[PDB]
């Protein structure tokens, strides 16, 4: 409107500003009518005398006016490193020292090859011929420094020089006595290369597989942060908040629930309850008149919400520790405080970090019951025995069988925190770094449940869900007088969740409640 | 710094 | 315009039957970077030993192009670049201090015995393939050891001191009208773009991280200058891009260029800096999934160039690039591995195999999706033949 | 030793030390306005308005002192590091083409705009007395005032990236290497 | 230690019958392998800390065989067609010239003339201060008797004279604005060596920040669902992108779903990466800027290349002298919104009423044509 932007760009910023709101950029495109970072250009300073071989289409189609340079794009700083690992560290330390060993071993090699042909001419060629011969500069084969740095390297720098000299004027002499100690190091090198193998593999051994653990070597440590009463209820609260921001500036009325969880699979449930069990059975935090308590509250709260039959548990259960020592129901709100909801959703973590195990299981079972060797390794014993000495690699049974038994294992403190990490990794390649906090999380969740029963008002408001799941039909009035009443022993300032859950799908979802 | 990691 | 769908397994095409000249010369690989240095020629040697244990020397032409000639290099650098890579050793880099820092020579990309030796190979190899595919004596020349996509007229950049592709590509346009030029090495192709910024008959296609990278270059929106206008496409890409979605960004985006800027050859740097364990890499590759890229490539039916170009982990590269090499003639290689010279740098299964690590994919849809809408309207100028 | 350079020249002067550092862009040398003839222009334009000799001659006398102090000071105090790489390959095309240098027939008129506001530091860095110190200055702030009136005809601001006609020119990595290397 | 005999050794009458290799001892034992000495096995400790507590099939010497020497292509050659360590000069690092005389030091290319470093004069190398030293002998008397014939001697330009004088005992020195003009704009600063730098440049992070940072921070904010804290530090609330109008972090049982999102530099709007296109936080170089500002550049064809540049920030010699408002009144960019680089103040109705006119009349030019 002064003449100094055109209508173009003015359309384009206005885009920026009202894009989303289609129909306002639509209006403002109506009425007005709307229908490289880098390479900085070199003038023409001075291209006159280069390229003493360029061709006419060579020299024009080419590009020399526009030049780009990584300071240009980088403001005079820039390049950062992506970080590794340490363990990927003494991987390229360790190839680094292999390079240097093959390098320099290859190389001799090249130069022994070729001094090994002079030296059979010089045989084959009489005395005088001998005196008479002289071999050019890079000894007639393609190359012409390969054979000076192998020299350089082995024989005295100085002399080294002096030799190079030689070798190329007379060799009647020179090229047999320095063939002689080019293999001579060959030898000696090969000795040094071959000890040296056995520790360099060794260490890939050890550390190969953390390399490649990225997501699972700082897991451990997130889980601790992100896996929190205030990260959980912040990703609630967000999710809720988008679904309000899409009511400021979108549909205002519609969001009935902001998580969605699922359950497609039933007999995790009593994998999560064995864990949980174990622990139990384990802690010495707890008393034994606590531990059973802590059991049946478990046992009773899945079998209530999920209608899982109590007796089912009760077989199953049993069954998994027998062979252990011979070695108009509908959807049905919840409604929760903050420690329900926690404890909650400790359980929804744990089934979603054991459903992954079950699919991948089926495909890793099938993967690793045919893991070949290949020839020369058992001959050479190049593979790694050490997760089958102590009976941690995953042949002979199934993933999501192995996954737990190592689980229990850990739990009750029998098997190392590090060897179940190595055990999950060289038989999932790296997919259940989620599963290297299973003690942690099933701890977690039966400290939230000892919460859940030993706080006061929470075993309260426990109690009537209790109350009103085993009831048979419910109105719309009996909902409200629940939501009431589960208020009722929560302060006006905590916070109220909606925990559904439909009997159909298994699936449950959540409906973070505003005051 | 304004080149690869390199070494 | 981004749907992801999962990686599905690699098969040979059954009507693409090709003649292969794949170029070595049992001398790259003898030449050091340093003592510390990330690149290394030895992985040549130990990609060539992998082809050479499998049964491939009898399905292919093993050539060793003749070293490049500094009359051949000066067609795309300068006579005194070229001069300064012939004369300069580690003994004499002093007297050059002036050029080394003009030319960019002694920090990154040093001053390492047989310096010239190692680019005339590389440089000879790009030449002479594109040489075979130009006098219809092969349908894709494989030189693992060119590659060099940093270099640029009068500058050794990024460990690249010869940017033999402009050479390649420069003898593949004494006979194509035109050239595609599909990089996937996680940098970016500065030295091969910039030589072909201005130019319609070289579409320089580069897919790569871009942000905080080496190259620095490569933004969505360097789509040349000049008559070269959309004729230069970017494809930024972040952290932990993995085999499914890779495959869904660099098909769709690849099938687009061939079927509007419809190439009469293409040359496809195959760097191993884009796989899982790079020692200066964030991508999250697997062999198949750097693969699937060359598969497709081929598919389209032109006569191509294979190039290595970047990779540092020595070992998830020369795997690749057998299992590239075993790839296009058409039979899939073996997962176990033979006996080779080098077997002990195998990990702990000794396979033909590199393993995608747990990293997060942050190239998220709906970026890709926006990344891929901007090239496909570019490559809508270029619908025009 | 208070020099008042007008707010749109030290606007140029900033634009200037913010592309020959910042952006990396030498000056494009021999400029179409070289600083003969901005102050000859300067000399022909002031001194027809001017009364009595003693100010037609305070004219005259004050640029032939600017030209010979230009000369003499440009190589040594008027360049970035940068443009010292341009400043020697000029010395150098000079030596070759056996021409020796005048950097007031070559320079533009930022240089001798940076002459002008690095004046007071050397005026003060003498024993130069208070009257010619005046007098100087009054100048000077009379040459400004007239550049000013003609600030759209030695400094305009065009894109070295999109016009070869622009008083800049971006540098190559191998010039930058050299002067900051 | 025995003489580095010159291996030939010739015997007779240069017949070389005899030999003398040189002793290796050196070049091995070196301890330059990246651990111990090349022609030595694993250390005991390498060894403790490390371990775990069918050549007949290798077709590689059939390659020689198989390889045909290739030369097809050009292949004609294509024939045809005690000392400083900072330069006094522009007060940085890097080769020097030391002055045998003076303790100051200068790069070879901030000499005058500049110094080929090639092409050294050699010998002995004097400063212009002790060049004039020893041409000056320190005394006062000679001085005069020699400026002030000097002086003399440039009547003509006698109002420059001593300007002119004090060149010569003058090192050269790199130009930098004096302190009075760069005061002028607030906002530009010199950098660490000169690099001058304007409110536009990120405050440069330190090492701490970048080569301590443990996996998961610093630019790792791409390799884990760790930095969740894209909330609302001040306020503990979420930071909305401008664009999608959502903050997304998805759950540490979902990660997937979280979309990275960024707080411009400028001013504190978050945008979602993926809604300003963008492939990386910014976290070095430049200071990040929205969509949402306004142009510095306006870069204007109608070739017509003008060029429009918004004033730089003057010090509060800033004037801001009132309008009457309504049309006309045409300002170049400048402005400053209110309820001789003088920054006009349109205040808001002025602003619609323009835009207004602006379109209107222009689309009843259209209809002229
Ligand atoms: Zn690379
Ligand atoms: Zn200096
Ligand atoms: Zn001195
Ligand atoms: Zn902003
Ligand atoms: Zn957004």
């Not at chain 3, 244990?53 to 050539?63: A, F, T």
């Not at chain 3, 750097?290 to 598919?299: E, L, M, P």
């Not at chain 4, 100048?139 to 005032?145: I, P, R």
Request: charged share 25%; hydrophobic share 35%.
């Amino acid at each position: 409107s002064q003449d100094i932007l055109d209508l173009d760009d003015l359309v384009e910023k206005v885009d920026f500003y009202l894009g989303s709101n289609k129909e306002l950029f639509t209006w403002f495109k109506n009425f007005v009518g709307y229908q490289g970072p880098s390479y900085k250009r070199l003038p023409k300073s001075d291209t006159f005398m280069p390229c003493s071989g360029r061709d006419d289409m060579c020299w024009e189609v080419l590009n020399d006016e526009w030049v780009g340079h990584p300071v240009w794009a980088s403001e005079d700083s820039g390049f950062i490193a992506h970080r590794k690992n340490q363990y990927e560290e003494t991987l390229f330390k360790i190839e680094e020292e292999r390079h240097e060993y093959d390098f320099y071993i290859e190389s001799n090699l090249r130069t022994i090859q070729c001094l090994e042909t002079i030296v059979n001419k010089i045989e084959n060629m009489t005395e005088n011929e001998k005196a008479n011969f002289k071999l050019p500069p890079g000894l007639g084969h393609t190359s012409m420094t390969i054979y000076k740095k192998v020299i350089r390297k082995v024989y005295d720098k100085e002399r080294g020089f002096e030799i190079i000299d030689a070798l190329h004027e007379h060799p009647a002499v020179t090229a047999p006595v320095v063939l002689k100690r080019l293999k001579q190091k060959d030898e000696e090198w090969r000795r040094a290369q071959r000890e040296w193998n056995k520790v360099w593999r060794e260490l890939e051994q050890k550390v190969f597989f953390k390399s490649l653990d990225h997501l699972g070597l700082t897991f451990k440590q997130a889980d601790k942060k992100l896996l929190t009463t205030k990260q959980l209820i912040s990703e609630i609260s967000s999710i809720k908040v988008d679904q309000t921001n899409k009511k400021i500036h979108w549909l205002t009325p519609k969001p009935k629930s902001q998580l969605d969880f699922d359950f497609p699979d039933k007999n995790i449930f009593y994998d999560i309850l064995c864990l949980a069990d174990t622990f139990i059975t384990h802690t010495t935090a707890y008393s034994n008149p606590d531990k059973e308590r802590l059991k049946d509250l478990l046992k009773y709260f899945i079998s209530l919400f999920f209608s899982i039959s109590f007796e089912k548990i009760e077989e199953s259960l049993y069954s998994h520790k027998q062979n252990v020592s011979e070695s108009n129901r509908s959807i049905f709100n919840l409604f929760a405080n903050t420690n329900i909801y926690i404890f909650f959703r400790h359980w929804t973590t744990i089934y979603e970090r054991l459903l992954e195990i079950k699919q991948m299981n089926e495909r890793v079972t099938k993967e690793i019951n045919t893991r070949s060797t290949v020839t020369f390794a058992k001959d050479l014993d190049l593979l790694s025995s050490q997760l089958s000495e102590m009976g941690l690699d995953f042949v002979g049974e199934d993933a999501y069988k192995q996954v737990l038994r190592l689980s229990r294992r850990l739990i009750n403190g029998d098997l190392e925190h590090q060897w179940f990490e190595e055990s999950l990794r060289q038989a999932y390649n790296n997919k259940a770094f989620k599963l290297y906090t299973i003690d942690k999380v099933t701890q977690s969740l039966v400290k939230h449940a000892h919460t859940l029963m030993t706080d006061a008002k929470t075993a309260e408001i426990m109690a009537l869900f209790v109350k009103d799941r085993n009831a048979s039909t419910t109105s719309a009035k009996d909902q409200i007088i629940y939501r009431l009443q589960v208020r009722s022993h929560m302060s006006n300032t905590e916070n109220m969740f909606r925990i559904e859950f439909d009997k159909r799908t298994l699936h449950v979802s959540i409906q973070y409640i505003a005051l | 710094x304004x080149x690869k990691x390199x070494x | 315009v981004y749907e992801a769908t999962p990686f599905d397994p690699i098969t040979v095409k059954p009507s693409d039957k090709r003649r292969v000249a794949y170029f070595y010369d049992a001398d790259v690989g003898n030449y050091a970077y340093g003592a510390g240095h990330p690149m290394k020629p030895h992985r040549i040697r130990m990609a060539h030993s992998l082809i050479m244990n499998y049964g491939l020397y009898k399905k292919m032409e093993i050539y060793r192009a003749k070293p490049a000639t500094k009359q051949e290099m000066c067609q795309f650098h300068t006579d005194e670049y070229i001069d300064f890579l012939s004369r300069v050793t580690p003994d004499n880099l002093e007297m050059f201090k002036r050029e080394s820092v003009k030319f960019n020579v002694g920090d990154d990309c040093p001053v390492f015995d047989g310096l010239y030796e190692y680019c005339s190979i590389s440089g000879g190899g790009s030449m002479e393939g594109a040489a075979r595919l130009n006098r219809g004596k092969c349908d894709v020349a494989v030189n693992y050891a060119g590659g060099l996509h940093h270099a640029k007229k009068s500058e050794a950049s990024g460990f690249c001191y010869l940017n033999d592709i402009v050479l390649g590509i420069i003898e593949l346009l004494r006979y194509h009208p035109r050239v595609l030029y599909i990089d996937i090495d996680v940098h970016h192709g500065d030295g091969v773009e910039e030589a072909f910024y201005t130019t319609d008959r070289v579409m320089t296609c580069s897919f790569h991280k871009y942000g905080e990278f080496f190259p620095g270059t490569g933004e969505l929106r360097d789509i040349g200058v000049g008559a070269g206008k959309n004729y230069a496409v970017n494809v930024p890409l972040r952290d932990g891009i993995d085999d499914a979605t890779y495959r869904s960004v660099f098909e769709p985006v690849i099938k687009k260029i061939m079927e509007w800027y419809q190439p009469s050859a293409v040359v496809l740097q195959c760097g191993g800096d884009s796989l899982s364990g790079d020692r200066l890499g964030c991508f999250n590759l697997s062999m198949e999934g750097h693969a699937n890229c060359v598969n497709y490539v081929k598919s389209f039916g032109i006569p191509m160039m294979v190039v290595g170009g970047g990779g540092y982990t020595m070992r998830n590269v020369a795997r690749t690039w057998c299992f590239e090499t075993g790839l296009l003639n058409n039979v899939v290689l073996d997962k176990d591995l033979p006996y080779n010279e080098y077997y002990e740098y195998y990990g702990p299964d000794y396979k033909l195999s590199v393993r995608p690590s747990n990293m997060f994919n942050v190239n998220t849809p709906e970026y890709l999706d926006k990344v891929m809408t901007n090239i496909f309207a570019n490559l809508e100028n270029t619908k025009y033949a | 030793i208070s020099l008042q350079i007008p707010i749109k020249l030290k606007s140029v002067l900033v634009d200037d030390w913010e592309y020959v550092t910042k952006d990396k862009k030498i000056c494009r040398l021999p400029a179409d306005v070289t600083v003969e003839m901005v102050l000859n222009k300067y000399e022909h334009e002031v001194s027809q308005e001017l009364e009595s000799p003693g100010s037609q001659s305070q004219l005259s006398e004050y640029c032939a002192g600017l030209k010979l102090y230009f000369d003499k000071c440009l190589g040594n105090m008027l360049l970035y590091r940068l443009e010292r790489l341009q400043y020697d390959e000029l010395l150098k095309k000079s030596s070759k083409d056996q021409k020796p240098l005048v950097p007031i027939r070559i320079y533009g008129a930022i240089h001798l705009l940076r002459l002008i506001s690095v004046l007071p530091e050397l005026i003060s860095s003498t024993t130069m007395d208070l009257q010619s110190c005046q007098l100087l200055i009054k100048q000077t702030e009379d040459f400004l005032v007239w550049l000013l009136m003609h600030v759209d005809e030695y400094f305009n601001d065009k894109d070295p990236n999109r016009s070869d006609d622009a008083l800049y020119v971006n540098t190559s990595s191998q010039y930058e290497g050299v002067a900051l290397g | 230690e025995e003489e580095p005999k010159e291996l030939l050794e010739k015997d007779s009458k240069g017949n070389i019958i005899k030999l003398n290799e040189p002793s290796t001892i050196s070049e091995d034992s070196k301890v330059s392998v990246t651990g111990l000495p090349l022609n030595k096995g694993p250390s005991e400790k390498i060894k403790r800390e490390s371990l775990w507590n069918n050549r007949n099939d290798l077709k590689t010497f059939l390659t020689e065989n198989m390889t045909e020497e290739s030369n097809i292509r050009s292949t004609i050659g294509w024939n045809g067609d005690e000392n400083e360590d900072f330069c006094s000069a522009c007060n940085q690092s890097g080769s020097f010239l030391c002055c045998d005389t003076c303790p100051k030091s200068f790069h070879f290319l901030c000499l005058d003339p500049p110094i080929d470093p090639n092409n050294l004069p050699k010998g002995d190398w004097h400063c212009n201060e002790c060049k004039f030293k020893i041409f000056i002998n320190n005394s006062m008397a000679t001085l005069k008797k020699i400026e002030s014939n000097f002086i003399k001697q440039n009547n003509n330009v006698k109002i420059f004279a001593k300007l002119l004088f004090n060149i010569d005992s003058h090192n050269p020195k790199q130009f930098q604005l004096p302190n009075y003009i760069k005061e002028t704009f607030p906002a530009v600063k010199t950098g660490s060596r000169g690099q001058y730098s304007d409110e536009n440049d990120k405050i440069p992070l330190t090492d701490r920040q970048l080569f301590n940072t443990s996996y998961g921070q610093s630019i790792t904010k791409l390799d884990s669902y760790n930095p969740d804290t894209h909330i609302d530090s001040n306020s503990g609330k979420f930071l909305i992108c401008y664009k999608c109008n959502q903050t997304r972090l998805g759950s540490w049982s979902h990660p997937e779903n979280s979309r990275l999102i960024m707080t411009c530099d400028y001013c504190q709007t978050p945008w979602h990466l993926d809604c300003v296109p963008r492939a990386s936080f910014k976290n070095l170089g430049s200071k990040w800027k929205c969509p949402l500002h306004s142009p510095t550049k306006v870069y204007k064809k109608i070739v017509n290349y003008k060029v429009w540049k918004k004033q730089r920030l003057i010090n509060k010699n800033q004037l801001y002298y009132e309008p009457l408002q309504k049309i006309g009144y045409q300002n170049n960019g400048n402005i400053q919104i209110i309820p001789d680089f003088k920054i006009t103040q349109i205040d808001e109705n002025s602003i619609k009423y323009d835009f207004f006119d602006k379109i209107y009349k222009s689309k009843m030019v259209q209809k002229r044509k």
